[PDB]
Amino acid sequence: VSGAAAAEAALMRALYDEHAAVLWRYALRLTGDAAQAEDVVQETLLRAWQHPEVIGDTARPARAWLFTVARNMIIDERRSAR
């Protein structure tokens, strides 16, 4: 039924509220740029939504999985971009 297509949203909006405002700070310290951090956060959380094999085991740290996603994306930008 439709309640499930709504449960997807209410599942994301329930991890945003607990992890986006903290993931932002990670990418901030690593970039010193709140604008990129703002971008990186959405990029990461989109991947998270795209990779449900991580949040399903609620009892396991998702935040810990997210930090590495971002930390990798930043350096991907820090390749020979100089």
Partner: protein, 49 residues
């Protein structure tokens, strides 16, 4: 005890009166949500910082 220390001044009495929330575990979360907004407020997460 706050009234005990700062009672000689009417301005502090009026501050404690005009206060919004009372309770050791209430003002703490108030501080947390004004200092680090957008995060879930845990009693110990605020007690730590």
């Amino acid at each position: 005890q706050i009234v005990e220390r700062f009672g000689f001044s009417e301005i502090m009495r009026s501050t404690l009166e005009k206060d919004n929330t009372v309770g050791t575990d209430e003002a703490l979360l108030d501080i947390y949500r004004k200092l680090r907004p957008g995060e879930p407020p845990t009693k110990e997460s605020a007690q730590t910082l």
